[PDB]
Ligand SMILES: NC(=[NH2+])NCCC[C@H](N)C(=O)O
């Protein structure tokens with residue numbers, strides 16, 4: 001029994017999916033281009049039927065924290081060495097696998113990026129960056145990436161976060177936790193449903209973690225506003241018996257002087273820490289983390305810096321792009 005839903009491709013199914021992604025990589029210039037963004041959800045209809053059935057059904061189940069698809073081949077020789085930075089990470093060896101993640105994502109929803117994160121890319125990279133071991137962003141290593149809702153600060157945050165493991169030779173775990181409903185008392189639960197908490201943007205939206213450009217110039221103003229003047233929001237929303245979750249372990253606080261909110265948040269921290277569990281994304285595994293049901297993070301690890309570090313491709317997915325239309329910055333697909 002597992003708190004996520006799991007699908008394992010047969011070799012033939014895995015090969016057919018890989019072949020489809022390879023065809024897309026031949027026919028489109030880029031994953032993030034207007035053309036593939038629009039076409040991917042229709043091309044995805046050609047994926048193996050058993051996989052399409054799993055994705056359609058598992059998305060509608062009440063319980064899972066993630067949807068995990070195992071068994072995509074990745075040839076390390078063809079893939080090439082892990083890049084030293086996300087900037088240079090669009091390597092030819094990783095291209096077909098970026099197309100594959102996009103195709104799988106297109107079965108779940110609408111993909112998007114942020115003007116203020118990795119130069120507005122839709123398919124982003126997770127890999128350790130030398131000098132950045134003890135930071136609060138996903139290019140950390142030696143410091144654990146604390147649990148979080150992705151883009152917790154933003155009402156336009158993803159419904160699902162998709163991750164494809166290109167390599168993970170030493171088996172570093174992703175961490176997950178749901179709402180600790182078996183332990184939250186009714187008074188604490190009540191307070192977490194109230195608009196008594198502050199959630200600021202995480203460090204991935206800072207200018208210094210993007211390139212020199214205007215690849216998102218004005219959108220950094222909105223990040224500054226969310227950082228300087230956060231509006232009080234609720235941590236829990238929806239059904240009391242199955243709440244949705246909005247929290248960041250390192251970027252959340254109580255509203256100013258609100259000691260009851262503080263107690264509720266401190267209790268939630270304790271209960272999430274106590275229930276956090278591990279999911280190891282082995283090479284070729286894809287996970288879609290439900291960013292409303294669960295928080296996620298990543299265990300501390302010693303980086304290699306020898307060309308074979310852990311490397312994921314990542315994508316933000318929403319069930320409805322039109323929810324974020326106020327933030328439609330560089331078209332509908334790059335928010336801020
Ligand atoms: N410690 C944290 N809460 N970090 C948030 C990290 C999330 C961000 N999208 C990143 O990839 O870096």
Ligand SMILES: [Fe+2]
Nearest residue numbers: 148150296297
């Ligand atoms: Fe994350």
